[PDB]
Amino acid sequence: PQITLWQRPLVTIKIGGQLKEALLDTGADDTVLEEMNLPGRWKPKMIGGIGGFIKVRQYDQILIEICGHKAIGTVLVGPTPVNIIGRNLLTQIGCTLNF
Amino acid sequence: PQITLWQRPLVTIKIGGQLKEALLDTGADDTVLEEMNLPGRWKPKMIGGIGGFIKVRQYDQILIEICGHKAIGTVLVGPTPVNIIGRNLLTQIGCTLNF
Numbered sequence: 001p002q003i004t005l006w007q008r009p010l011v012t013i014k015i016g017g018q019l020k021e022a023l024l025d026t027g028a029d030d031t032v033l034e035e036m037n038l039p040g041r042w043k044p045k046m047i048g049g050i051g052g053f054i055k056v057r058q059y060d061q062i063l064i065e066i067c068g069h070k071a072i073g074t075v076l077v078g079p080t081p082v083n084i085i086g087r088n089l090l091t092q093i094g095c096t097l098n099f
Numbered sequence: 100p101q102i103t104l105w106q107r108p109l110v111t112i113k114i115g116g117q118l119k120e121a122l123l124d125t126g127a128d129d130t131v132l133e134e135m136n137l138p139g140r141w142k143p144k145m146i147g148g149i150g151g152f153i154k155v156r157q158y159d160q161i162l163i164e165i166c167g168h169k170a171i172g173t174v175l176v177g178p179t180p181v182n183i184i185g186r187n188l189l190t191q192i193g194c195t196l197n198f
C-alpha cells in the first residue's frame with residue numbers, strides 16, 4: 001500500500017503466534033516491542049531515545065508478519081510505550097518514503 | 100524524491116536562518132529540534148518517548164524548509180538527541196510510506 005501520514009502509520013503484525021498493532025517508524029533503526037512472551041534465548045541491551053535509555057531483551061532471527069509481508073530479523077522487547085517497526089524490518093518489506 | 104531506508108532518512112532543513120540536518124520520522128507526531136536560537140514567544144511543554152519525558156519550548160507558525168519544500172507549523176525545541184521532522188510537517192510536504 002501507499003500510507004499518508006495524517007494519522008499514525010499503524011499496521012497489524014503477527015509475531016510469536018500473537019496479533020499486535022505497531023507503528024511504521026522511519027526514525028527507528030531497530031524494532032522495539034512492548035513486553036510480550038517470545039520463545040528462546042535473548043541478550044541484554046540498553047537503547048536510547050528522547051527521554052533517556054531502557055533495557056531491552058534482544059531476540060535474533062525472529063519471524064514477523066507486517067501487514068501481510070514476512071520478515072526475519074532482530075526484535076527488542078522491553079518497556080517502550082508503543083510497538084515500533086524500525087528500518088531493520090522496513091527495508092525487508094520494501095518500505096520507502098516519497099515526496 | 101523517493102527515499103529507501105537502508106540508511107537513516109536524513110535531510111537538510113533551513114529554520115530560523117540556520118542550516119541543520121534532521122531525520123524524517125513517521126513515528127513522531129510532532130517536530131522536535133535540538134537546542135537552537137529561535138526568535139519570539141514560546142510555551143512550556145513536556146513530551147514523552149522511549150526512556151521518559153523531556154521539557155521543550157513550543158514555537159508555533161515557524162517557517163521551515165525541508166529538502167527544498169516550505170512548511171509552517173509547530174516546532175518543539177529541547178533536549179532531543181537528534182532533530183526529528185514529525186507528521187505535523189511531513190503531511191505538508193506530501194510525504195508518504197509505500198510498500
Ligand SMILES: CC(C)CN(C[C@@H](O)[C@H](Cc1cc(F)cc(F)c1)NC(=O)O[C@H]1[C@H]2CO[C@H]3OC[C@@H]1[C@H]3C2)S(=O)(=O)c1ccc2nc(NC(C)C)oc2c1
Pocket residue numbers: 025026027028029030031032046047048049050080081082084086122124125126127128129130131146147148149150181183185
Ligand atoms: C528519537 C528517535 C531518533 C528514535 N525514536 C524513534 C521515534 O520515531 C520515536 C517513536 C516513539 C517512541 C515512543 F516511546 C513513543 C511514541 F509514541 C513513538 N518517537 C518519539 O520519540 O516521538 C515522541 C515525540 C514526538 O512527537 C510526539 O510523537 C511521539 C512522541 C511525541 C513526542 S526511539 O527513541 O523510539 C527509537 C526507536 C528504535 C530504536 N532503535 C534504536 N537502535 C539503536 C540506535 C540503539 O534506537 C532507537 C530509538
